[PDB]
Amino acid sequence: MRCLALDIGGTKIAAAIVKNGEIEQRQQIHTPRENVVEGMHQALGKLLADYEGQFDYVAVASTGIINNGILSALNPKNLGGLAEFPLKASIAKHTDKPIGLLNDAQAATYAEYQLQNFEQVSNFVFITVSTGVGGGIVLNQILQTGSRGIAGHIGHTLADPNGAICGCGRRGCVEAIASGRAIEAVSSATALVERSAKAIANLIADLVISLDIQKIAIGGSVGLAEGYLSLVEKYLQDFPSIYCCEIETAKFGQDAGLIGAAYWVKDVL
Amino acid sequence: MRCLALDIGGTKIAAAIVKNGEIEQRQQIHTPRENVVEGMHQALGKLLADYEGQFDYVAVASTGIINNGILSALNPKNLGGLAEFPLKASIAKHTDKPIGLLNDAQAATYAEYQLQNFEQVSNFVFITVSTGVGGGIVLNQILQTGSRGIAGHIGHTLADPNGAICGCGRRGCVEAIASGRAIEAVSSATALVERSAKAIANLIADLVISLDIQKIAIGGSVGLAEGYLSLVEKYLQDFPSIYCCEIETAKFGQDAGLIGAAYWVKDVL
Numbered sequence: 001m002r003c004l005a006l007d008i009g010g011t012k013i014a015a016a017i018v019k020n021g022e023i024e025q026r027q028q029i030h031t032p033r034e035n036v037v038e039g040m041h042q043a044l045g046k047l048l049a050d051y052e053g054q055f056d057y058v059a060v061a062s063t064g065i066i067n068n069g070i071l072s073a074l075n076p077k078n079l080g081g082l083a084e085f086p087l088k089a090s091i092a093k094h095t096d097k098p099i100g101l102l103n104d105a106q107a108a109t110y111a112e113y114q115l116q117n118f119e120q121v122s123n124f125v126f127i128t129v130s131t132g133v134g135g136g137i138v139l140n141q142i143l144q145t146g147s148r149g150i151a152g153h154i155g156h157t158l159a160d161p162n163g164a165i166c167g168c169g170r171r172g173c174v175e176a177i178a179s180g181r182a183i184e185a186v187s188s189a190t191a192l193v194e195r196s197a198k199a200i201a202n203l204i205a206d207l208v209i210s211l212d213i214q215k216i217a218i219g220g221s222v223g224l225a226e227g228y229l230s231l232v233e234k235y236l237q238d239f240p241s242i243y244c245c246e247i248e249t250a251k252f253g254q255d256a257g258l259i260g261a262a263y264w265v266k267d268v269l
Numbered sequence: 270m271r272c273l274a275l276d277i278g279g280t281k282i283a284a285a286i287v288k289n290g291e292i293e294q295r296q297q298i299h300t301p302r303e304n305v306v307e308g309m310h311q312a313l314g315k316l317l318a319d320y321e322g323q324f325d326y327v328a329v330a331s332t333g334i335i336n337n338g339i340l341s342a343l344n345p346k347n348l349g350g351l352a353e354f355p356l357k358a359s360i361a362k363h364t365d366k367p368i369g370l371l372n373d374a375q376a377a378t379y380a381e382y383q384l385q386n387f388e389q390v391s392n393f394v395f396i397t398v399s400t401g402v403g404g405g406i407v408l409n410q411i412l413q414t415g416s417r418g419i420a421g422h423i424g425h426t427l428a429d430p431n432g433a434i435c436g437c438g439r440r441g442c443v444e445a446i447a448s449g450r451a452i453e454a455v456s457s458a459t460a461l462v463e464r465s466a467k468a469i470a471n472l473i474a475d476l477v478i479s480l481d482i483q484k485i486a487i488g489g490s491v492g493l494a495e496g497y498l499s500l501v502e503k504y505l506q507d508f509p510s511i512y513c514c515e516i517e518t519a520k521f522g523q524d525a526g527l528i529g530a531a532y533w534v535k536d537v538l
């Protein structure tokens with residue numbers, strides 16, 4: 001049908017009309033860095049004005065833990081210090097069409113999985129390495145969300161018990177070491193990108209041995225970066241082969257959240 | 270019905286008759302430390318002689334990755350250097366009754382989960398801290414095994430990228446830092462047990478944020494050790510509360526593999 005898709009990230013908000021699977025009227029605005037609550041409300045109202053009368057429903061792919069129309073920030077530092085935002089309510093102010101909501105990496109995992117050889121890939125993870133580090137887990141071709149929408153927050157699993165404190169409050173999260181935010185927090189060389197890639201290869205090994213994942217797609221601004229995937233591949237062959245699996249770049253690229261949310265909201269009516 | 274249960278571990282083999290859910294004729298013999306292939310065959314044949322004519326089926330809970338009647342050792346050092354053993358075949362030499370096979374921690378996870386408030390606990394993990402470190406994952410009240418029987422090998426996820434090399438070939442596995450084998454590999458103080466408990470609290474945090482686990486049961490010789498659980502609990506409250514969940518000791522104790530395998534083999538006919 002006709003979908004209004006939002007992809008709220010810590011750095012960018014995207015928006016588009018997914019119609020019969022195709023992205024039409026793409027926009028991309030900065031995510032507010034200050035006055036964030038006021039800013040999120042103005043941005044959502046603007047974006048909903050722009051697409052007035054062209055959608056049957058609203059699908060939202062949002063960074064953070066999404067449960068009961070509420071965005072809870074595991075890492076408030078991705079959302080400009082914001083802890084929580086009444087995401088569905090704020091959107092319902094502007095339309096009475098249905099509104100469905102999903103974590104941003106869960107939505108992207110749904111998108112990329114649709115492109116899988118469904119019978120020979122039943123356990124699949126998509127990893128975003130962008131502003132933060134996010135993930136989604138499909139197991140027996142079912143997307144995990146959890147009772148609370150937490151499933152997939154693989155960026156806040158342990159990369160190093162002696163590493164930086166993460167913005168979530170935990171020490172040594174993968175996101176605290178590998179993410180875009182973590183990379184440019186130190187640069188203010190090549191060796192920086194390697195530390196990020198090695199941490200992501202450890203996370204891949206972890207998900208393989210823990211969940212018997214058969215395939216992993218990598219996305220996000222850092223993940224899709226020319227040369228990154230090959231660096232993660234190089235670190236994966238230090239492991240015993242049992243930890244290896246095939247890694248490919250996300251094929252929807254930066255649109256995977258839009259299409260995933262659009263198709264996910266539809267496909268669980 | 271009438272079940273012959275085997276619980277093959279890196280240090281002990283147990284055996285018993287599970288009948289109508291109760292353990293009867295328990296035995297426990299050392300797991301061979303040398304001449305291991307010959308030893309595993311003699312032990313299985315002995316144990317099968319002892320219980321001749323008293324079982325309808327054989328349920329095997331085995332350390333290692335269990336796929337197609339074959340035990341593959343992720344950490345051969347737990348099985349006295351053994352890499353692989355034709356586990357189901359060796360047992361089929363002595364009976365024509367059916368033989369079902371499961372990882373040892375997957376079986377125990379099945380046991381302990383049966384004691385859960387099924388509606389309010391749908392995502393559950395059981396962690397063994399014994400000879401090695403093992404685990405099983407229940408998600409939407411379904412035990413994960415994987416296409417290859419790997420799901421649950423949480424002992425070989427990352428605890429420290431600068432820690433000991435694990436016997437699996439990977440550096441810094443949880444098992445390489447927290448396990449019984451890892452503890453007594455250094456002692457040859459209190460601070461040792463703490464390092465083990467802290468690593469296990471990081472693993473608990475990991476499984477909670479990654480899979481939205483609602484409850485975790487701890488088992489095994491180290492896990493059930495007087496004072497260990499409280500030490501893991503103490504390390505869990507250093508984390509933001511989102512990573513916390515309720516931890517209780519395994520209630521079947523050292524019989525969870527026997528009953529789990531017995532009931533699992535039956536319950537997926």
Ligand SMILES: CC(=O)N[C@H]1[C@@H](O)[C@H](O)[C@@H](CO)O[C@@H]1O
Nearest residue numbers: 063064073074075078132133134
């Ligand atoms: C606001 C927030 O805490 N986002 C999480 C996680 O939900 C996101 O998926 C990830 C990437 O978007 O960044 C962060 O790790």
Ligand SMILES: CC(=O)N[C@H]1[C@@H](O)[C@H](O)[C@@H](CO)O[C@@H]1O
Nearest residue numbers: 332333342343344347401402403
């Ligand atoms: C032989 C072997 O590699 N066993 C694994 C794992 O399968 C077991 O569950 C764990 C505890 O039994 O030890 C080891 O980590």
Ligand SMILES: [Zn+2]
Nearest residue numbers: 156166168173
């Ligand atoms: Zn974190």
Ligand SMILES: [Zn+2]
Nearest residue numbers: 425435437442
């Ligand atoms: Zn290991």
